[model samples]
Target: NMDVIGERIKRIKEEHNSTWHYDDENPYKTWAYHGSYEVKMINGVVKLLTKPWDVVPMVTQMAMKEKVDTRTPRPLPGTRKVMEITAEWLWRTLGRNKRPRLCTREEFTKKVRTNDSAKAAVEDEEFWKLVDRERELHKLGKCGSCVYNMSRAIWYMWLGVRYLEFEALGFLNEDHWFSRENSYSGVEGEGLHKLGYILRDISKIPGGAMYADDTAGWDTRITEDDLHNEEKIIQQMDPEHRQLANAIFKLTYQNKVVKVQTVMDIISRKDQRGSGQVGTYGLNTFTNMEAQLVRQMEGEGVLTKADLENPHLLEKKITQWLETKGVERLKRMAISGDDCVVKPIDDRFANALLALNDMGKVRKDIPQWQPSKGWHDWQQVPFCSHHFHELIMKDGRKLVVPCRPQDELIGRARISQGAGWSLRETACLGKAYAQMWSLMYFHRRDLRLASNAICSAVPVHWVPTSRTTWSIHAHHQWMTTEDMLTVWNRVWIEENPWMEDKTPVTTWENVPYLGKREDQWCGSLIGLTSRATWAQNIPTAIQQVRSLIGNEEFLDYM
Candidate 1:
């Protein structure tokens, strides 16, 4: 394998430049771990000479848009500790009866009954969820002030409920393009909030388990497919399973004693921090979730060699377990990874997912990801939790293919609808959004420069997960023209005004949230960063990384 890798590597290097030494003596020639490496096999131990821990390659920082700093990147220290149970005994005596009161249904109803609609909203389950969200938001100190807190609370509840009423009445309806004008599906006490509460309820009872769906792929799966035909995903789940999710949500907040508590929700994340992300803002990815799951389930007695050693047996075991649990087919599954986790709602969910951990009959390997968290020991973890389902191919061949849930639908919809003028301009919402992100980035840069203070500005970057995905980024960053137009063939940017459905963006002053304010943390004054010059610096950047890491490492990026 190394010989073949070394052979191909030589061919590429030869084409790269005139001077690429290729011989047995060359260190690059010998080190190949399928994904390219520099190795030393001393007395049966393969030591990687690359990825020096204390001494990092200089080129790594330059590739990152991070401002140049000589100090080494290091891991944060751990300050974790577990406590004694005396705190629980103290809480019962001192604080049990004296907690600040929730001005519940009666108080809320008494205040807002001026409107018949507000009166009905007080009894609505959704209104209470909204109340919980207001509590969470105020707890964060984002909008609550001593003087303004009461007014803010009343205004937030009433207006938000009113907005929902208007939305249902079709009073504020706009193009489907702006369907998510103020939509917050995964915001606090929203989609993910409901999911967390449901998970905690499941955790408390006999069946509740850490049920994050380990979907396959880097699995942003965040895909075009999931956004499209997600209807099929719904059909796949039986009605009772759908009923199960709803019932579980109920258990989390029923009569006070029967309710699901947040403290017991061990596996739920405040937000999906952990697994995989892209770009600088939130490009998180999971590297070891599968192997970790392997050890976890095996210790729990839920796993056996049959789980991974035999896929057929694994599927069969799942069926048998489902029958015993009195459950039908799996509920609709949603996954968020390279090592995506699944909600093990019951034994059936857990046993079935054990097969996903690449330990199944079809094992494969891959190199460590580029820009990995330092001192690289390549991605030795082979366990991959792929999000795939069976398909009967048109040609009578059976296939297993990747899938995405509707998690990224609104996002894709925006991308599809916005900046839709590659050939002819249709709408420029995408352009407008990017312009804001970029403008704020530049604004921060300017403020720091003015203050003689240092700050880092990473330009907007997102990995395109689909061909239909397009960006103003590749054009601005690389001096390349996006000549091809996939969509967006209506408006011309030359004389454009803005509308959600049929508008174009002009680089102008800043918009605060709803774009109502004049000055903010930073403001856009005719956007001075525009029409400014920046260098691609392409040639030299490629040249330095070549020597910094092994040549093949450089070759991979290219």
Candidate 2:
């Protein structure tokens, strides 16, 4: 199976020194280490902590040893444990806990064979009868919990990666709020406070808040004072935390229930808020606190009056907000209830705001300008007023149409629909195939590696079998080639025998390419080997497409 094949390919890569190597001889080409673990390690931790075994104690211990912490105080054993457990539980429960492993070919085959049964279960009478129950959950957004948890994990993982970078750069100590193991278990208010601390801490990084140096070039070198300024702006704008009093002060002053259009219009007014444009005085200038608040409100109840008039209720208790308000209510109130239609929050903007806030440069008068021109223009506005605007926006009270104006009737609708279509298309083919091929290789190798079946295979041209790795034999052997071809030919014959009539022999020259283009084989034996040199030239074909799209700007964004 593809899983086995992927394992084999990975093993081949490791044997050939294709992966990161920290050997002194390769100093110039040494590994670019990001923390101590690969992506798999983090995923594994997430899975283990959520299972019946619930190795949360081990996880918490490991984190504490590594000096990691949550934003809030933990529960019983500590809040750190609670958050980690919660995160792990949520990740596992949602089925977002990735457990990437090398499976044997037999394992792969067995799993694939079960797919039909799974599908049948979903299609059968018994399953359909439960549709209403599922529908109810779907209406409440609970049905999408898997996706939401996956997204949250991804978001948190990215944050973790950033935290590691900050530690690497000495911009943030491991002692910082998010890095602390006990930060996840505090009282609701304290938890929220910890969140502020984490955000504030992130904003203070010298090279921009929560720097993703390993991923993107979002380096914004600002002073410490700049971050402090940004935090002040956030505080002033925050409705619940803005005032020292016990009661929360609403961001917008008008007591009357106002239409979303009217509120948006008011924001657009030069005096109230600049045209809620991307780069100008619009949603782009919203503070982090305000944005989150709005998201919380929206989550509680979509675009309805409850969101605008009583969002504070949701903030009082997040878990209750989720349970009581229900997903359906929120969806009904949200401008775009369909998770499929909602646009992702702009990471660039979020990072920029955090950076500014940490440096204490966040002021109502000074607009947090983004390097990207995708959002509205935000000139310097008063810090206090800017924050208040964000608060109102975050309440999710304003009903921004899910679809753009043009999309509503006859607009291009390309960007919005395009995103959805692209995701479905990729899932149906590109990534799925890649995953299949990857799994096949992985599983094939795991059989040999896990069982030590290849332990005694010696290379005729090499030294002792113990020292000689698979690559030495695999790369040099005509036998390996023959075996692969035999498998390929068998598959081909089963799928299409007409080709055999024209060409009885399955020549190495006829290996089919499986990527965006043809002429490349699915296996590393061909595509990655010198025998299939055309694979090396595949980049030239890709460059053609890149040329059509202009420079490497798209790659940079991606």
Candidate 3:
């Protein structure tokens, strides 16, 4: 036994600090040896020392012993009064109304609706009354009108149902699941108007137990895996009784309320998984309630040597008690069913509806434009003057033709088609329409500046294809070759646009133009003669132009 004790000390030293020396005279060594001194009788001589070297030799000869003291202390009489006063104080400070009363459907309608008109009248009367009261208070050197009262006039303007039509349409009087009386006082009304008011008041309370059964329901939701994990953690705390603790863990999982004595008896058990250093440490791990219950049970002779050997009988009793009371109460009070009114609206529907008026406005501004073919016609369209014709050639070939001259020229060029045609055509039509409008405004109305002054002016080709393929071509031509060269020069001046010691203009001069050169560009206007091609669709073209600009300037023009 002495050799075993010495081995344990050596093992503890090795695990914690292998370098620790008993002969060292440092502060840490002195404190470790003399922190708690003890006396012991060895070889028939009493030995006393505040040194680890002296204690280790005596501890080596130490044999295990067990002692039982049955003597109990006398209870104090006045402790009962102290406990009663404490309980009363706790009730007064922490207790809340268990069952809050709710108004019936009929009662709510009568109180809130009867004074509907009178309530408004009362609020109006109170506004001036508060105003006068504020003046009196100010004269008497008290405070002025409350901030809430000051905003009452403006606040009431937005409050209450203004239209009888709203009530007729069933927009008002939609009943809430929870009665208004049970709900927070601030939000005691019908429909979503009171929703925010209820939430704000509920958040102000402590513990937030506004809804009953939240705690009981939460406890019931804990899975068996959580209990298993707790048991596994307790098993690994020390080495002893690690495997033989299964029966104890079974009792913990089976019973809804685990008693303290039940856990203590399991810890004290000496079997294959023997009780050694673990029992004392394991007992310390229990909660205050469990520890208190164990002390009370032990003192009352509820747990004896016999119960420590057999825990099943006590575990069965606990299981029966829980089945009758614990789960039944929780199951009865838990929240159930759908309880709220407002549902979520799809964002797609909301976006389409909000933009509906703008789409209508755009269509109205451009009357010459007609919808594309089929169901998706409303979303895509082509200008009426940019209409197409179905033509049959001598070789029995069917081809779509652009009616307008500018569109005809663009179609002959065949710059783009299909999906590409759709984007290019729309952009071209938008740009050409803006240019034509600016030119007309400048020539007929005001033309003090020449053609170069119209920087916004650009060429656009309105080429309508088959009904299935609605394409408009637009080209931005504000900057000339000279303007582009000027921008390149500016960039060159700031820093090297290319690598250092390289010239860009020289490279451009070396490359010859490769593409076919046309005599006349499509959508180009010589004078007022070619204006007829786009004049019919001027209003529609102007709408596209307005859409292209899409800012305050366009709104100002309108």
Q: How close is candidate 3 to the true structure, as a TM-score?
A: 0.13
Expressed as tens digits, the lDDT of each residue in 202-320 for candidate 3 is 33332212221011111222223223322432322233233223323332222211101201110111111111111211211111112122222222333333443342334443333
Candidate 1 vs candidate 2: the TM-score winner is: 1
Estimate candidate 3's alpha-carbon lDDT, on a 0 to 1 scale.
0.24
Q: Which 10 successive residues of model 1 have the least lDDT summed?
A: 75-84
Error of 1 at 252 (Å): 48
lDDT, candidate 1, at 16: 36
Model 2 C-alpha lDDT per residue in residues 1-558, reported as the tens digit of each score: 122123222332353343333233221111121111122212121121112212324333333301111011111122112122223322232222222121232332343354223333333444333433433432332221111011222232222222221212111111221122322211111211122222232233222112111101111111222122222322222342223111100111101011111011000000111111111111111122222223333322332333233323333344443345323221211110000011122333333333223222232333444432221211111111110011111222211001111111111101121233432232122222222222122122211121111111111122111111121001121222124345444433333322233233345334322222111211112223432343334334334434432332322100
Residue 493 lDDT (model 1)? 23
Best by TM-score: 1
Q: Which stretches of candidate 1 lie over 4 Å from their true place?
A: 1-20, 23-302, 305-332, 336-341, 346-431, 434-558
